[PDB]
Amino acid sequence: PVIKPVIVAVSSAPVSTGGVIATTVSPTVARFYAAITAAMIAGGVTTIPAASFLDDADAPVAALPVPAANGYYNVYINGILQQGGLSTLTAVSLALASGDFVEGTPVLLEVGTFGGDSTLTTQPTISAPTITIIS
Amino acid sequence: PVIKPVIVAVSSAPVSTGGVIATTVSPTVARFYAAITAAMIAGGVTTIPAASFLDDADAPVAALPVPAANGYYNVYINGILQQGGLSTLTAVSLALASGDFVEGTPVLLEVGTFGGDSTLTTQPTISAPTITIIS
Amino acid sequence: PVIKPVIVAVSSAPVSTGGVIATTVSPTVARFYAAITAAMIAGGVTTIPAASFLDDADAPVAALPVPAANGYYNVYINGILQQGGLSTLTAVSLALASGDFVEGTPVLLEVGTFGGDSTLTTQPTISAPTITIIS
Amino acid sequence: PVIKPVIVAVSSAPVSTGGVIATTVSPTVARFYAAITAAMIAGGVTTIPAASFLDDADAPVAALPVPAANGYYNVYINGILQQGGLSTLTAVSLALASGDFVEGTPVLLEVGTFGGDSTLTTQPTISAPTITIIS
Amino acid sequence: PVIKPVIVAVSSAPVSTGGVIATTVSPTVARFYAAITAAMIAGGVTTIPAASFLDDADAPVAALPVPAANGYYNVYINGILQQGGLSTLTAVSLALASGDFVEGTPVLLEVGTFGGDSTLTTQPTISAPTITIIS
Amino acid sequence: PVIKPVIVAVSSAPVSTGGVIATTVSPTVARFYAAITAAMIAGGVTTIPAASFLDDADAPVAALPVPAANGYYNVYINGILQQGGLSTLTAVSLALASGDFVEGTPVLLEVGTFGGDSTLTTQPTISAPTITIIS
Amino acid sequence: PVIKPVIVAVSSAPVSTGGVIATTVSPTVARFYAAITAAMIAGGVTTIPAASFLDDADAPVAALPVPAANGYYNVYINGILQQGGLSTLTAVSLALASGDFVEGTPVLLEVGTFGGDSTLTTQPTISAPTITIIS
Amino acid sequence: PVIKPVIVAVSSAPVSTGGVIATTVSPTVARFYAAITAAMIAGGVTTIPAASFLDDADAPVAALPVPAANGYYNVYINGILQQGGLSTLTAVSLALASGDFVEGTPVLLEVGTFGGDSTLTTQPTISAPTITIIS
Amino acid sequence: PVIKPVIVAVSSAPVSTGGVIATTVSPTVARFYAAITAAMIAGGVTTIPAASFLDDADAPVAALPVPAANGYYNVYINGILQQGGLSTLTAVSLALASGDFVEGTPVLLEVGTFGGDSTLTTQPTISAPTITIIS
């Protein structure tokens, strides 16, 4: 017959204090060139294909990074900004309202993205709980 | 006369053991149009009312979202950016420092805003405290 | 001889719950002016110095804030965006790979930076541990 | 006719001298186990009958040896001596005062008895009497 | 002249046979309670003096029945017995070794006494003397 | 020729009356300390040998006063009595059945002995016998 | 005338010669018994009254043969032959000096008498006388 | 022829005077001793034979001189005279009535005889007779 | 010349008849007492001398009337008679055979004598003598 005292104890809920975090922002801007001609202006659905585009130095482009919910795109017609009414951008081409243009003019298109990163540097401090002993 | 043993105990303060967070950035860019003429030219400081503008898909404009300290605004005059010296944008007009323009140069306003959000993905783990029995 | 009962107790590991993070984004855009001339054009590698620039509200220029990993810059030639081929901007000048411009081409530079801060608003709640009594 | 002398004699009373007594003392201590759960705790009439008790070798008991005039008993609650207040032990149960605590704490009853035996080792010597002759 | 015969006689001391003694023993155990506080601890003669005790049921006690040569006493500290090292109980207090305790140690004292009574039941039998007649 | 009268006498057996007996009881309680560790605990026949003990005021001991037929002993495990199941104390050690517990674990032994002596205070009184003269 | 001679003669006186006489003595001893008790005993006149005797075998006696001048009496008290100082014997009783006695004592009296008879066996022889004439 | 006177005479009868006679008495007292035992007690005819004696100077006797007509005998039982009820001396033994005593009870027999002789001292004197002459 | 006749006569001795003798016996019994002690017991000649005797009515005596040939004496020791062995009376003391006695035993002596007288009451009758005349 082994006999031991019956003692129980409960613990409280500790409370955290403080905390410090740091953040970083990463921009990215892509530059694509266009050389629109009259071989595609048909009075409507004037869409320059995803293959008629140069790039940051010389290389031709194959597809366009359609702006997601974390970026913006701008369309330059003869170097003048145009509102997002005659500028619909897919991965295939750029919908330009209707065909009303001139002979070959420099059209520029600007696409930018944004990414963020953050981490917890100074970690919170936990208050010591309380212990009550029940006999 | 009930007699119980009297035992007390104390608890140490735990510590945190690392964590991680995720961050997203949501940009927004708004485009507004102008058809400035000599009707409201004044010379010197020039004012263009917030109502003589059209927006995006030719929608009329009432006022302008004055940029706070979370965004930037650009002022275009014939497609050539001009610095803040010529630009002062209130909610009713744009204070044009220059007073000599032409008969209908295309002026555009590029106003952008930024917003972000974050959440705790992997919550920190709490170390086990130490408790000592006092007789 | 003083005698006391021998009792030991071990604590568990608490668990954290919840957490809320609020973030802010602070974008800045700087605009620098230029007026190119055939004096600094040498049929290529036109290296327009960090002193032949205008600044914001006609203030003199000192140097160029080279874009770091948290910013972007655009190079304008007569108000037409040009890709990285014509743009390699150090703190003393701009690359301008080739020189074929005219007398007094209106050129200007935009440089942007991005910073953000965040704080912990709703600090996570810590679950209470468990206490076991060893006789 | 038969004639005989008439003589009468009287004796005195002898006197003792005392002896020596040897004594023995026989103690006996009985130990009974208990388990005071909340089964019969009623806050004032908390009383375990002579059935929820173990014995020296874990043998279930039948009744309790009521302390007579030649014995004593102590009531232990959690291994602490308790005074007469929490003790009204009878042949069927022990009447604890009120009780208030967790599932069965170690409760112990010690019941002691005392018996003694003695005998006369050296028996007292008797003094000789005196005889007087009356003629 | 009266003239009577002269006769003398002698007697022999008798012999005692047998005998038996019946014995009884009476135990008594007293229980006193203590309610130690910081008044006791002085690093010297750490005592509760006289009346700062409880008693068997409720009624406070005045003095202490010093253990004579026919009784025993035990010192209970938190339910753990202690030897003569910390027991010098006088009629005033309990002279413990030194003050190194806690706030609320459950302390109580047991004091025991013993008394015995015996009677002679079967009175010893006495043998008969021998009388010798001397002429 | 010397001639003397022939006389013989007989004596009865006296009977005595009662007596007085006075008794004393001498109890003795010995206390031996222990401090049991994992030195020889084997989950069975754990028996703390000989002088792995203390006595009264430190004073290391040699052996144990085996309880004879005129005494009693108790075994304390962390301040809780244990019955004969785990107590067959010899002159060497205990006879603990097993024991699974942290080191130290205050264990105390109480050994009690009882002795008594008595004297015959009031010696019995002897009644006077009867003498019969036979001529 | 007658004429006769005148002659006268005288005779002397004879003498006796001895003789023989024979004598006889007749003794007689009478025995009387007494059973004196406390029904009589007085201060100085203790005298067993006449008939308070028994004679020879069983027959009670009426009076006592007072000792004459030709006899003697002896008085036995408890066998011892007392002297005449304690004895004065008459017809009614015997004067036992004074009253100083004990419980009934065996006493008896002896009274003796003496008588003598004698006869003349041989008669004396007488001598012959002498005769002388006177002419 | 022879012639003689015829004269006759007669004599008277002389008378005698008194005389003197003297007597002597010769008493003899014989003493015999015995020790009566239980070898002859039969509740009657307890008769000690004529040889069961010791005589005066410890010289055992053969017979008993029974007093015929000039003697008296007394019987002694433990020194107390008895009477004719228990006394009848024949030539062989006594005539104890029944007898009851302890062995060797002192018993003595006294037997006496009386004899006397007398002589004639003074011879009687005879008177002178008277002589008368008858012529 | 004177002439006278010659006559001679002769007498005859007569004879005596008759005679009556009367006798008396005078008995005397002396009585002496002794209170002998151990002050003079010498072992062989323990004999009470002369005046160490109380006589009759307690009058002290001088010497002892030695038994002549006309008397007898009896020696009483503790009431029991004795014989010639412990008896020889001289004018000085007794002749007890040896000293083997007790303290203060009553020893009493009786001395008797016998004397008698007689007279010739009736005188003898003398016959008449015969006388013859011889002429």
Residue among B72, B79, B89, B84 nearest B27 (CA): B72
> Best mutation site among D8, D28, D29 for testing chain F: the one with the most F CBs within 10 Å?
D29
CB G113 within 8 A of CB G71: yes
Residue B42 carries which DSSP code?
Answer: -
State how beta strands D53-54 and E21-34 pair: unpaired
Sign of CA dihedral C96, C101, C103, C104: negative
CB C72 within 8 A of CB A27: yes
Count how many pairs of residues, chain A against chain B, have C-beta atoms within 8 Å. 103
Set of chain F residues whose Cβ sits within 8 Å of the Cβ of H104: 6
Sign of CA dihedral H57, H59, H60, H65: negative
Three-state DSSP state, H84 = helix
State how beta strands D71-77 and D53-54 pair: unpaired
Residue among A80, A78, A77, A79 nearest A94 (CA): A77
State how beta strands B71-77 and B107-122 pair: antiparallel
Q: Supply the Cα-derived Rg of chain G in whole angstroms.
A: 31
Sign of CA dihedral A85, C113, C80, C98: negative
Tell me, yes or no, if C55 comes closer than 8 A to chain B by beta carbon.
yes
CA angle D46, D52, D57 (to 5 degrees): 140
Backbone angles phi, psi at G36, to 5 degrees: -50, 135
Exposure of I91 by Cβ count < 10 A (0-12 exposed, 13-18 middle, 19+ buried)?
A: exposed
Three-state DSSP state, D83 = coil
CA angle E103, E108, E109 (to 5 degrees): 140
Backbone angles phi, psi at G86, to 5 degrees: -90, 0
CA angle I85, I89, I95 (to 5 degrees): 45
State how beta strands G131-134 and G8-11 pair: antiparallel
CB A53 within 8 A of CB A64: yes
Of C1, C5, C135, the CB nearest to F54: C1
Contact criterion met (CB < 8 Å) for G23 and H118: yes
Chains in contact with B, where contact means 3 or more Cβ–Cβ distances below 8 Å, are: A, C, D, E
* Min distance F3 CA to chain I CA atoms (Å): 7
Of E1, E5, E8, the CB nearest to I79: E5
Residue of chain D whose alpha carbon sits nearest to that of E17: D123
CA angle I111, I112, I118 (to 5 degrees): 160
CA H17 – CA H127 distance, rounded (Å): 8
Set of chain D residues whose Cβ sits within 8 Å of the Cβ of E118: 23, 116, 118
Tell me, yes or no, if H98 comes closer than 8 A to chain G by beta carbon.
no
Contact criterion met (CB < 8 Å) for C29 and B131: no
Neighbours of E132 (CB within 10 A): 12
Dump strand ranges (E) for B1-135: 8-11, 20-34, 46-49, 53-55, 59-60, 71-77, 80-81, 93-96, 107-122, 131-134
Set of chain A residues whose Cβ sits within 8 Å of the Cβ of B11: 11, 128-131
Residue among C17, D17, A10, I90 nearest E13 (CA): D17
| End-to-end Cα spacing for chain A | 22
Contact criterion met (CB < 8 Å) for E3 and I58: no
Of A6, A8, A134, the CB nearest to D106: A6
Domain positions in chain E: 24-115
Residue among D7, D133, D9, G102 nearest F128 (CA): D9
Backbone angles phi, psi at I7, to 5 degrees: -135, 135
Assigned token pair, F11 = 């004596």
CA H93 – CA H47 distance, rounded (Å): 5
CA C66 – CA G77 distance, rounded (Å): 175
Sign of CA dihedral H50, H51, H53, H56: positive
The residues with which D36 forms a beta bridge, in sequence order, are: D105
Backbone angles phi, psi at D84, to 5 degrees: -65, -20
Assigned token pair, D129 = 């009497």
Assigned token pair, F17 = 């009356």
CA I6 – CA G133 distance, rounded (Å): 9
Residue of chain E whose alpha carbon sits nearest to that of G99: E2
Residue among H129, H119, H126, H131 nearest H20 (CA): H119
Residue among I29, I25, I116 nearest I73 (CA): I29
Helices and strands, number each (H, E), in chain G: 0, 11
CA D132 – CA D43 distance, rounded (Å): 84
* Min distance D129 CA to chain G CA atoms (Å): 24
Of D1, D4, D5, the CB nearest to H85: D1
| End-to-end Cα spacing for chain D | 22
* Min distance F39 CA to chain E CA atoms (Å): 22
Specify the amino acid at residue G125: T
Tell me, yes or no, if D83 comes closer than 8 A to chain E by beta carbon.
yes
Residue among A92, A47, A83 nearest A65 (CA): A92
Specify the amino acid at residue I54: L
Tell me, yes or no, if D7 comes closer than 8 A to chain E by beta carbon.
yes
Three-state DSSP state, A111 = strand
Interruption sites in chain G after residues (C→N beyond 2.5 Å) = none
Specify the amino acid at residue I9: A
CB D16 within 8 A of CB F124: yes
CA H120 – CA H122 distance, rounded (Å): 6
What is the separation of C-alpha D34 from the centre of its chain, rounded to a whole number of angstroms?
24
Exposure on the CB side of residue B95, measured as CA atoms within 13 A: 9
CA C88 – CA A55 distance, rounded (Å): 15
The residues with which F50 forms a beta bridge, in sequence order, are: none
Exposure of D50 by Cβ count < 10 A (0-12 exposed, 13-18 middle, 19+ buried)?
A: middle
Three-state DSSP state, H39 = helix
CB F110 within 8 A of CB F31: yes
Exposure of C17 by Cβ count < 10 A (0-12 exposed, 13-18 middle, 19+ buried)?
A: exposed
CA F6 – CA F19 distance, rounded (Å): 41
Sign of CA dihedral B69, B71, B72, B73: negative
3-class secondary structure for C51-100?
Answer: CCEEECCCEECCCCCCCCCCEEEEEEECCEEECHHHCCECCCEECCCCCC
Give the dihedral of Cα atoms H130, H133, I4, I8; nearest 10 deg: -70
CB G108 within 8 A of CB G31: yes
Chains in contact with E, where contact means 3 or more Cβ–Cβ distances below 8 Å, are: B, C, D, F, G, I
CB H30 within 8 A of CB I122: no
CB B20 within 8 A of CB E76: no
Assigned token pair, D91 = 């042949």
Residue among F9, F124, D124, F119 nearest E15 (CA): D124
Assigned token pair, D95 = 């009447």
Q: What residue has token string 């004459």?
A: G68
Tell me, yes or no, if E78 comes closer than 8 A to chain F by beta carbon.
yes
What is the separation of C-alpha D105 from the centre of its chain, rounded to a whole number of angstroms?
30
Under 8 Å CB-to-CB from A48, ≥6 apart: which residues?
A: A34, A36, A40, A93, A94, A96, A107
Sign of CA dihedral G48, G49, G52, G56: positive
Dump strand ranges (E) for D1-135: 8-11, 20-36, 47-49, 53-54, 71-77, 80-82, 93-95, 105-122, 131-134
CB A4 within 8 A of CB D105: no
What is the separation of C-alpha B19 from the centre of its chain, rounded to a whole number of angstroms?
28
Give the dihedral of Cα atoms A56, A58, A64, A70; nearest 10 deg: -10
CA B46 – CA D84 distance, rounded (Å): 105
CB A109 within 8 A of CB A74: yes
Specify the amino acid at residue A73: Y
Tell me, yes or no, if G79 comes closer than 8 A to chain D by beta carbon.
yes
Residue of chain B whose alpha carbon sits nearest to that of E80: B5
Tell me, yes or no, if E135 comes closer than 8 A to chain I by beta carbon.
yes
CB B135 within 8 A of CB B123: no
Contact criterion met (CB < 8 Å) for E79 and C3: no
DSSP string, A4-22: ----EEEE----EE--EEE
CA B24 – CA B118 distance, rounded (Å): 6
Q: How many residues in chain H?
A: 135
CA angle E128, E129, E135 (to 5 degrees): 140
Residue among C20, C29, C8, C55 nearest C110 (CA): C29
CA A86 – CA A92 distance, rounded (Å): 16
Write the CA distances from B53 to A74, A79, B42, F72, I16, integer angstroms.
19, 20, 18, 111, 242
CA C93 – CA C80 distance, rounded (Å): 19
Residue among I21, I40, I32 nearest I120 (CA): I21
Specify the amino acid at residue G6: V
Assigned token pair, A117 = 């990163």
Set of chain D residues whose Cβ sits within 8 Å of the Cβ of A134: 102
Contact criterion met (CB < 8 Å) for D133 and E9: yes
CB I113 within 8 A of CB H26: no
Burial annotation I56-76 (CB, 10 A radius, 16+ → b, else e): eeeeebeebbebeeebbbbbb
Under 8 Å CB-to-CB from I58, ≥6 apart: which residues?
A: E1, G85
Tell me, yes or no, if G134 comes closer than 8 A to chain I by beta carbon.
no
Q: Supply the Cα-derived Rg of chain I in whole angstroms.
A: 31
CB H132 within 8 A of CB H9: yes
Residue of chain A whose alpha carbon sits nearest to that of D32: A1
* Min distance B29 CA to chain C CA atoms (Å): 13
Q: Do chains C and G touch, with touching meaning 3 or more CB–CB pairs less than 8 Å apart?
A: no
CA angle E115, E120, E121 (to 5 degrees): 120
CA H96 – CA H46 distance, rounded (Å): 5
CA F5 – CA I79 distance, rounded (Å): 9
The residues with which F76 forms a beta bridge, in sequence order, are: F81, F108
**Interface list for F 56-75 with E (CB within 8 A):** 56-58
Of D8, D21, D80, the CB nearest to F119: D21
DSSP string, chain F: -------EEEEPPPBEE---EEEEEEEEEEEEEEEE-TTS--SSS----TTSEEESSS----S-----TTEEEEEEETTEEE-GGG----SS----S-----SEEEEEEEEEEEEEEEEE-SPPEEPP--EEEE-
Tell me, yes or no, if F9 comes closer than 8 A to chain C by beta carbon.
no
CA G14 – CA G129 distance, rounded (Å): 5
CA F37 – CA D47 distance, rounded (Å): 38
The residues with which H84 forms a beta bridge, in sequence order, are: none
Contact criterion met (CB < 8 Å) for E3 and G82: yes
Residue E123 carries which DSSP code?
Answer: P
Specify the amino acid at residue D76: Y
Alpha helices in chain A (DSSP H): none
State how beta strands G71-77 and I8-10 pair: unpaired
DSSP string, I41-54: --SS----BTTS-E
Specify the amino acid at residue H32: F
Tell me, yes or no, if E6 comes closer than 8 A to chain I by beta carbon.
yes
CB H122 within 8 A of CB G12: no
Tell me, yes or no, if F35 comes closer than 8 A to chain E by beta carbon.
no
DSSP string, E21-60: EEEEEEEEEEEEEE---TTT-SSSS----TTSB--SSSPP
CA E6 – CA I104 distance, rounded (Å): 7
Specify the amino acid at residue F78: N
CA E64 – CA F35 distance, rounded (Å): 31
Three-state DSSP state, A27 = strand
CA E59 – CA D97 distance, rounded (Å): 17
Assigned token pair, F41 = 């605990």
Specify the amino acid at residue F107: V
CA H2 – CA D60 distance, rounded (Å): 182
Residue of chain I whose alpha carbon sits nearest to that of E134: I102
CA C115 – CA C25 distance, rounded (Å): 6
Contact criterion met (CB < 8 Å) for D85 and B5: no
Backbone angles phi, psi at H10, to 5 degrees: -130, 160
Specify the amino acid at residue C101: F
Contact criterion met (CB < 8 Å) for H131 and G11: yes
CA C87 – CA A57 distance, rounded (Å): 10
Neighbours of D88 (CB within 10 A): 13
CB G101 within 8 A of CB G41: yes
Contact criterion met (CB < 8 Å) for B5 and D83: no
Backbone angles phi, psi at D52, to 5 degrees: -95, 50
CB G132 within 8 A of CB G7: no
Residue I95 carries which DSSP code?
Answer: -
